[PDB]
């Protein structure tokens, strides 16, 4: 018997207007990781239940523009990629690049800057094989990265993350 | 915090060939009710976990023909209806009916005998208002789905799967 | 304020196998009319409620094969037509015809004998203009839907469901 | 001002089982032409109205199997073709042919023998140019031909023809 | 025998421009409840009929922008949730929230601020079980709540509520 | 034998910017009726053809914005309703309403102000039962009818309206 | 044996802003005819081949806005109509019209001024019956007309015409 | 200037009932090639027109069952594959195979034996690059489409139509 | 740089007619596992190409009826389930079951006996985390799990053609 | 056995506002070619593997507006065309044209300036027939896709992504 718990949190994300080499195409990127404790603030504590292990079965990231940005105002496209190891940490690019850093990655999916994206993924921490983790709740799971060409104007987004967490006795 | 558990069970159902007033249209009906205990045989009891109460959020009934019955073989249509009280029990009538007993009911939906059906429902048992039942508690019966059918010229066997989507609260 | 009441009844219909001029195409037809009293067997008279008038806003006829007839077994096509006057009464044809009697009618819709049909219509009885009839009153005949068919090689039995959408006003 | 009249008639059509060269693929064909008088027998005549001319705007042929033939019982495919002159008459095939006689024709459309077909066409008779004809009603309009590979068993069809006729004063 | 009556009413709704913590993501929410007297006039009226009980079978809320707001103008997304008791009242928030108050709820559905939303629900008042209430018509039914991230500019909406009410003798 | 004639005419319609109770939600409405004479501007009387009766089988109203109005610019929604009697005439509202006057009506359909609408209807005038009206006065018989409501917008919106009549004549 | 040749040409078309009866609805219209020589400027001549006759089987007209016009900017709707004789010429009206001149015509199809339109047609010149013309190439074929309510601002379009021409030996 | 010509021809194809290792899964295959001369039997030669060269831009193969075979009668699935050189000839196949010979090939697409298939392809013969062939020239063989199938329990007859879309330029 | 190789093999599978508890509903099940060596007999070992590791990114199982079985002949439904450990091995049932053994499993998907099924999965063998396995071959024989499928026992025997597809990555 | 590799690169493309013959319709065009070395870097690299040959099975070009251009702001339509030899070079037009230079071409596909386009193609370099090239080598240029456009009233900037689907064999 597997019990499932859905958790969610939100935050703002900004893509800043291009200020260097204006008129040329440059890319940047960022990334998101997942830990059960990131989502256990407004929620009672699972350890008080007689569950032995938990597993992050599925995660969802949805980032959509706000601040009055026009969806019909084109700002190019970047990519999203599911990267399931610590290597993802290098994708909060400190320097601008001339090429999209995530387009070459396995399973890279295009997304349009002015419309945002929604993507499902299976983030990864016997645990190494199945993902079942003893209750622990701070174990980092990787992960989703997203790239973008730098736009002419700053764009603000609302990001919602959703965890689909499994528990077994 | 709401935890969700999916449970399922299956069984055979048979619509027997018409042997009475053959050549004329007659209807019968049957029904299904839901209790958490119906689904807790291969599964430990959730109260061994420190859950306070449970609620049957959703139920699904899918009944599909087997035994070699042809789906393209027309055997008319009956109806399904969600009936959320003990009154549903009156619907497996020992005697045949001349009219479809469920067609008049609120939310009745047609189904073709040779195809079967799939239907979702919210079966119902302060608990009387919310549906939360303390974790004998697992045996509270929830109602309910009835299904009617015109009697066919030949017997039809079905595979039925029931699914419970059960909520547990901390 | 308009209150709506949905009523339904079912019956068997049969298209008999062709026995005359076998091997040639012949057509027959039948028709259905609607009266509130046809549907009030299981319901008290709405006049016991303080309703003054009623109106048959909409009617639905669904006729689907049964008796094991194969839907993939081709038996040609006839037509359905909404006929809102006494002329419809001539369409329970006592004699066979060489042409489809309903195909020429305004709004005629093709239907395949082996599949049946479903059709909505607005049957017709200040009453003459609006359809509002004082609540005798429940027996006013409303017309109407006719359906034609080429005579098949073998007898086909159908289950017919009729639905009335009846309006009542305050 | 154009007034439109819809006329229809039906008849049985039969494709006989192959009795020659059994086991080999052969094709035959037939055709249909349209004249207003073909459809006016059960219809009060337009002659009684003060219309000057008529024109066959559109014609429809629908031929569907009957006699208990199974639609899932495959019997190959032939073609339909719109042929707008007297040449069509040669397509009531006297002799079996080794190739589909209509497949090469302009606008030929496949149809499956066990399903039948539905096809719209603009049959053709200043009248030669526009189609307007003085009220006359026996002018022949061409036309639709249909071919078929000869099946192993006889198949009977119900055929409905529909005329969409325009009238002007 | 069940007789059905459809009732409807409309009103304006405003999401005010963000004036606190400007530049940061904050959420607010509101809610709607349903009483038959919200929709009824003195004429015509079901009380004058001989019905014994009524039941709100279904309710519909549709809220759509007006005032010239651009639908292609992105303003993020909030959530709707069906809440079937008086607790819903705590979602008319006086204090702004850093997290979406309805996203965690069972059955929460995303909606985009600049688009509005349409949602069906079964609001709740043996009456507690079936919903049948003696005619009375002031009984309050719950309920639908909706959240939103505070936008940069005020947005005005047209809201239509619809009740599908059943009556029995 | 039924002969069908399709007729059409167009005109401009305007919803004026709200000038009363500005900032609050108010509704207005208007309506359209149909007479064969409305559409026979350029066609001889069908009676000169040997037709005896006519019947308005179907009518269509399509109203779409013009004047550069943005379809993506939201201006709320009103309703359309088919009203087949003289009661429709009261929907040329001289006074503003706080509620949508057509939303409660049987068959009311929502439409978005910034998009316009298209709707089919069967307008109504033995004639009372069937709709067949003698030709000769007959062509001026008014048929009812479609009404449409709207919340008053912040700015004036101009529309193009096309009406289409599907008229039957029998022998 | 029928050989087919596809030819295409483009040009600019303009609907000028309304200057007469400003504030009121007025209509205008224009039209397009087809001759093989209109399309043989950058293509070798077919008579160098041993083709006896040619026939314009199909024509396509596509007119789409340019010059930065917003497709979401409503400017009403007009109609297109296929008119297969020389009378089509009367539709380039020197005077504005109070009604849409093409809406009454058989087969008229609505088109929205701010989106443009695309339409297929069979333009018309034994030749009158079939359309086969001896190679001749200047024969005029009619034709497609399009009407429009006059807009508040000028709208520029790109028009592409395509001919599908048949040749037989 | 490019002129286009559509040509077509038909023939019967049969998949014989399994007679070897009956009860076990075995595969066979066949193939089709294209030459303009295959399609010019009822057509004059384009060189009588002053065309210099031709090119097969596109080819279509459609093979559909006949002889009364039931499309709902499951007989497994094989594959089709476009193979653009003479190696296509290697699927004779003189010996039955235990594996589907075309499933591994690039671009292989599944087809169900009881339904047949339709597929478009670009068959291939400066000419080696462009495909333009001077107008013996009409006999250049273009490759090609192969199709495999698991051997059925009963013989299945098909009608096959090939279509050529040939370009000619001045 | 990731290089992808698609490999496929086929075989026959049979569901035998019910001979125990005839007239009652019983279920059985079977399962499939994946090893690169199961698909690499015609192809030389990818280690002869200068590849160091391989990883089974994706696997597909498609099982469709043959032997003349009618797709319109109903024979109920079972389930498929992705099981990524040794537990799958117990699902070639030695005994008939009164309940569907795979219906309770995470991600179980219904399939109809008379139609067959098609399902994609990610079968599982730093290798334990990522799936990258060294080439040498012991590596190419590492068993990956896995897909199990259950079925109600039918009244007559049904034969299927099964095609397995491996999507293998090399770096 | 065929191993497949996906490669991608991006760059900015710009259609400049019209400055000549302002007010009249004129066309210009450009083109893209493909070489494996356009997409490769010094490490990792295919040469270090024991592959005999490679070939570009498929290429994809996607060009989409950026810089804040409104997709709903109409700027007409041009065409894309696959041109598989060096003649394509003549389509980076130095002089403005009154007619669309690619619209007459075989397989020309319309595209709207304000929306951009996505197109698949088979670019071309026994090698001339099949595309297989020995690992010249990775520098062989493959042709090719050209795209035309009516000159707009304002400058439009695009992001372009090219994708190569490369096959390798031992």
Numbering used by the authors:
A (entry chain I), D (entry chain C), E (entry chain H), G (entry chain B): 46 to 170, 189 to 198, 206 to 239
B (entry chain G), C (entry chain J), H (entry chain E), J (entry chain F): 46 to 170, 189 to 198, 205 to 239
F (entry chain D): 46 to 170, 189 to 199, 205 to 239
I (entry chain A): 46 to 170, 189 to 199, 204 to 238
Paper excerpt:
Here, we present three high-resolution X-ray crystallographic structures for distinct macromolecular assemblies of the capsid (Cap) protein from the beak and feather disease virus (BFDV), a circovirus infecting critically endangered parrots.
X-ray diffraction to 2.0 Å enabled the atomic coordinates of the 10 nm complex to be elucidated. The assembly buries an extensive surface area of 13,650 Å2, of which 60% is associated between monomers contained within each pentamer, and 40% buried at the interface between the two pentamers. Monomers within each pentamer are arranged radially around a central pore of ∼7 Å, with Tyr115 exposed at the surface of the pore, and Val117 lining the inner surface. Interactions between the two pentamers are also extensive, with every Cap monomer forming interactions with two Cap molecules in adjacent pentamers, burying 655 and 415 Å2 of surface area at each interface. Thus, in the absence of DNA, Cap preferentially forms 10-mer complexes, where the highly accessible ARM domains can mediate nuclear localization and DNA binding. Understanding these complexes also provides a platform for the delivery of novel therapies, with the decameric structure representing the smallest viral nano-cage, exhibiting highly desirable properties including a charged interior surface capable of binding small interfering RNA sequences, and exposure of the N-terminus providing a plethora of cell specific tags to be engineered to direct viral assemblies.
